[PDB]
Design an enzyme around this catalytic site. Structure first.
Site, mmCIF file in Angstrom:
data_model
loop_
_atom_site.group_PDB
_atom_site.id
_atom_site.type_symbol
_atom_site.label_atom_id
_atom_site.label_comp_id
_atom_site.label_asym_id
_atom_site.label_seq_id
_atom_site.Cartn_x
_atom_site.Cartn_y
_atom_site.Cartn_z
ATOM 1 N N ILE A 72 -4.247 -9.417 10.848
ATOM 2 C CA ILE A 72 -4.418 -10.754 11.402
ATOM 3 C C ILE A 72 -3.841 -10.800 12.829
ATOM 4 C CG2 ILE A 72 -3.957 -13.243 11.083
ATOM 5 C CD1 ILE A 72 -3.469 -12.615 8.092
ATOM 6 N N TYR B 271 4.013 -10.872 1.207
ATOM 7 C CA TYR B 271 3.610 -10.202 -0.022
ATOM 8 C C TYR B 271 3.572 -11.212 -1.142
ATOM 9 C CZ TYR B 271 3.972 -5.668 2.215
ATOM 10 O OH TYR B 271 3.816 -4.564 3.034
ATOM 11 N N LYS C 104 2.566 -1.138 9.876
ATOM 12 C CA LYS C 104 3.663 -1.762 10.636
ATOM 13 C C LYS C 104 4.270 -0.791 11.645
ATOM 14 C CE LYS C 104 5.672 -5.414 7.850
ATOM 15 N NZ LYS C 104 6.671 -5.627 6.753
ATOM 16 N N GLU D 159 -8.431 -3.367 4.264
ATOM 17 C CA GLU D 159 -7.168 -3.845 4.815
ATOM 18 C C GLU D 159 -7.441 -4.734 6.017
ATOM 19 O OE1 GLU D 159 -4.875 -0.412 6.019
ATOM 20 O OE2 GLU D 159 -6.323 0.036 7.634
ATOM 21 N N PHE E 278 -10.793 10.481 14.475
ATOM 22 C CA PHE E 278 -10.078 10.589 15.737
ATOM 23 C C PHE E 278 -9.239 11.863 15.746
ATOM 24 C CE2 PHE E 278 -10.986 6.022 15.293
ATOM 25 C CZ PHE E 278 -11.563 5.743 16.539
ATOM 26 N N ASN F 276 -3.204 -5.557 2.290
ATOM 27 C CA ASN F 276 -4.085 -5.142 1.166
ATOM 28 C C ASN F 276 -4.262 -6.209 0.118
ATOM 29 O OD1 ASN F 276 -3.796 -2.339 2.268
ATOM 30 N ND2 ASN F 276 -1.661 -2.750 1.577
ATOM 31 N N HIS G 89 -2.074 -12.675 14.644
ATOM 32 C CA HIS G 89 -1.072 -13.740 14.677
ATOM 33 C C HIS G 89 0.267 -13.104 14.377
ATOM 34 C CE1 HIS G 89 0.809 -17.683 14.222
ATOM 35 N NE2 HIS G 89 1.281 -17.295 13.048
ATOM 36 N N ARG H 130 -18.332 -1.649 14.116
ATOM 37 C CA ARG H 130 -18.673 -0.243 14.189
ATOM 38 C C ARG H 130 -18.376 0.464 12.893
ATOM 39 N NH1 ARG H 130 -14.056 2.820 14.363
ATOM 40 N NH2 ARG H 130 -12.068 1.870 15.007
ATOM 41 N N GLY I 77 0.814 -1.202 0.000
ATOM 42 C CA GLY I 77 0.000 0.000 0.000
ATOM 43 C C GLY I 77 0.853 1.260 0.000
HETATM 44 C C1 LIG Z 1 -9.254 -2.530 13.003
HETATM 45 C C2 LIG Z 1 -9.028 -1.163 12.432
HETATM 46 C C3 LIG Z 1 -9.914 -0.102 12.710
HETATM 47 C C4 LIG Z 1 -9.681 1.149 12.130
HETATM 48 N N1 LIG Z 1 -10.552 2.159 12.382
HETATM 49 C C5 LIG Z 1 -10.334 3.368 11.838
HETATM 50 C C6 LIG Z 1 -11.251 4.483 12.113
HETATM 51 O O1 LIG Z 1 -12.294 4.285 12.783
HETATM 52 N N2 LIG Z 1 -10.960 5.687 11.576
HETATM 53 C C7 LIG Z 1 -9.886 5.892 10.785
HETATM 54 O O2 LIG Z 1 -9.697 7.048 10.317
HETATM 55 N N3 LIG Z 1 -8.985 4.912 10.487
HETATM 56 C C8 LIG Z 1 -9.157 3.657 10.995
HETATM 57 N N4 LIG Z 1 -8.257 2.649 10.699
HETATM 58 C C9 LIG Z 1 -7.153 2.985 9.760
HETATM 59 C C10 LIG Z 1 -5.759 2.937 10.275
HETATM 60 O O3 LIG Z 1 -5.696 4.266 10.739
HETATM 61 C C11 LIG Z 1 -4.909 2.472 9.065
HETATM 62 O O4 LIG Z 1 -4.609 1.107 9.273
HETATM 63 C C12 LIG Z 1 -3.556 3.096 8.751
HETATM 64 O O5 LIG Z 1 -3.657 4.455 9.121
HETATM 65 C C13 LIG Z 1 -3.165 2.939 7.260
HETATM 66 O O6 LIG Z 1 -3.015 1.593 6.749
HETATM 67 C C14 LIG Z 1 -8.496 1.377 11.249
HETATM 68 C C15 LIG Z 1 -7.631 0.313 10.987
HETATM 69 C C16 LIG Z 1 -7.858 -0.933 11.560
HETATM 70 C C17 LIG Z 1 -6.907 -2.069 11.261
HETATM 71 N N1 LIG Z 2 -0.480 -10.009 11.506
HETATM 72 C C1 LIG Z 2 -0.365 -9.568 10.257
HETATM 73 N N2 LIG Z 2 -1.480 -9.039 9.643
HETATM 74 C C2 LIG Z 2 -1.361 -8.424 8.414
HETATM 75 N N3 LIG Z 2 -0.179 -8.349 7.710
HETATM 76 C C3 LIG Z 2 0.927 -8.871 8.310
HETATM 77 C C4 LIG Z 2 0.860 -9.469 9.567
HETATM 78 N N4 LIG Z 2 2.119 -9.887 9.905
HETATM 79 C C5 LIG Z 2 2.934 -9.536 8.909
HETATM 80 N N5 LIG Z 2 2.233 -8.872 7.902
HETATM 81 C C6 LIG Z 2 2.849 -8.327 6.672
HETATM 82 O O1 LIG Z 2 2.644 -6.940 6.774
HETATM 83 C C7 LIG Z 2 2.248 -6.340 5.563
HETATM 84 C C8 LIG Z 2 1.477 -5.043 5.800
HETATM 85 O O2 LIG Z 2 2.286 -4.029 6.448
HETATM 86 P P1 LIG Z 2 1.905 -2.540 6.263
HETATM 87 O O3 LIG Z 2 2.906 -1.724 7.099
HETATM 88 O O4 LIG Z 2 0.428 -2.330 6.618
HETATM 89 O O5 LIG Z 2 2.175 -2.114 4.773
HETATM 90 P P2 LIG Z 2 1.286 -2.147 3.423
HETATM 91 O O6 LIG Z 2 -0.120 -1.818 3.752
HETATM 92 O O7 LIG Z 2 1.834 -1.040 2.590
HETATM 93 O O8 LIG Z 2 1.488 -3.509 2.761
HETATM 94 C C9 LIG Z 2 1.448 -7.477 4.911
HETATM 95 O O9 LIG Z 2 1.432 -7.425 3.479
HETATM 96 C C10 LIG Z 2 2.174 -8.720 5.364
HETATM 97 O O10 LIG Z 2 3.243 -9.008 4.481
HETATM 98 MG MG LIG Z 3 -1.179 -1.878 5.512
#
Ligand SMILES: Cc1cc2nc3c(=O)[nH]c(=O)nc-3n(C[C@H](O)[C@H](O)[C@H](O)CO)c2cc1C
Ligand SMILES: Nc1ncnc2c1ncn2[C@@H]1O[C@H](COP(=O)(O)OP(=O)(O)O)[C@@H](O)[C@H]1O
Ligand SMILES: [Mg+2]
EC number: 2.7.1.26
Length: 147
Positions: free
Chosen positions: A81, A90, A20, A78, A108, A28, A83, A103, A14
């Site tokens: 997991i 990837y 991370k 997105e 925020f 994604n 775990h 929800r 992404g």
């Molecule tokens: C379980 C979960 C809930 C989330 N809820 C929100 C939210 O309510 N509002 C928001 O702006 N972003 C939300 N995000 C986005 C989060 O801010 C995002 O993972 C990173 O900023 C970009 O990948 C959420 C992400 C996850 C994984």
């Molecule tokens: N618990 C997990 N849940 C989701 N992705 C994981 C997990 N553990 C490792 N990954 C790895 O993390 C990547 C996502 O990291 P992230 O920082 O969100 O970057 P991006 O969204 O740009 O791929 C996944 O593609 C996968 O390779």
């Molecule tokens: Mg991501």
């Protein structure tokens, strides 16, 4: 309406900075997968089950949002997991069963509130997935074919 929803897709990178950075990696799919979501799968936060390739099935949360960046009016998806993986995955196929809704998306005012909210979603998902009605989906043939 369209839960449980089952889908599979290649794990792709992404944009912006990856979550991370927060200790909460979010995988994604290609936009083709998101585009085939039924319209009734509104934006918001969902929970369910996921496996990677032929791996075991684990709890997960999914965020479905609106994509700012594509023409028309496209969604984003997105999956985090619950775990700890020893390496990235990837290009592997992520198999997901979206089973329940938590929800709507929320605005925020700080990263502190956002991170606390996401951690809370993860904890609530873990509890809800223990309900016998959702616990069984872990054993769906959807996942058993993937091993
Ligand atoms: C379980 C979960 C809930 C989330 N809820 C929100 C939210 O309510 N509002 C928001 O702006 N972003 C939300 N995000 C986005 C989060 O801010 C995002 O993972 C990173 O900023 C970009 O990948 C959420 C992400 C996850 C994984
Ligand atoms: N618990 C997990 N849940 C989701 N992705 C994981 C997990 N553990 C490792 N990954 C790895 O993390 C990547 C996502 O990291 P992230 O920082 O969100 O970057 P991006 O969204 O740009 O791929 C996944 O593609 C996968 O390779
Ligand atoms: Mg991501």
């Amino acid at each position: 309406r369209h839960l449980p929803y089952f889908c599979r897709g290649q794990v792709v990178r992404g944009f912006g900075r990856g979550s991370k950075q927060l200790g909460i990696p979010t995988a994604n799919f290609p936009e083709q997968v998101v585009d085939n979501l039924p319209a009734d799968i509104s934006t918001g936060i969902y929970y369910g089950w996921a496996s990677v390739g032929s791996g075991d099935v684990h709890k997960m949360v999914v965020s479905i949002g609106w994509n700012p960046y594509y023409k028309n009016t496209k969604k984003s998806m997105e999956t985090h997991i619950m775990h700890t993986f020893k390496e990235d995955f990837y290009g592997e196929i992520l198999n997901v069963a979206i089973v329940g809704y938590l929800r709507p998306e929320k605005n925020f005012d700080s990263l502190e509130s956002l991170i606390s909210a996401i951690q809370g979603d993860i904890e609530e998902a873990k509890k809800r997935l223990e309900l016998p009605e959702y616990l069984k989906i872990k054993e769906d043939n959807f996942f058993q074919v993937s091993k």
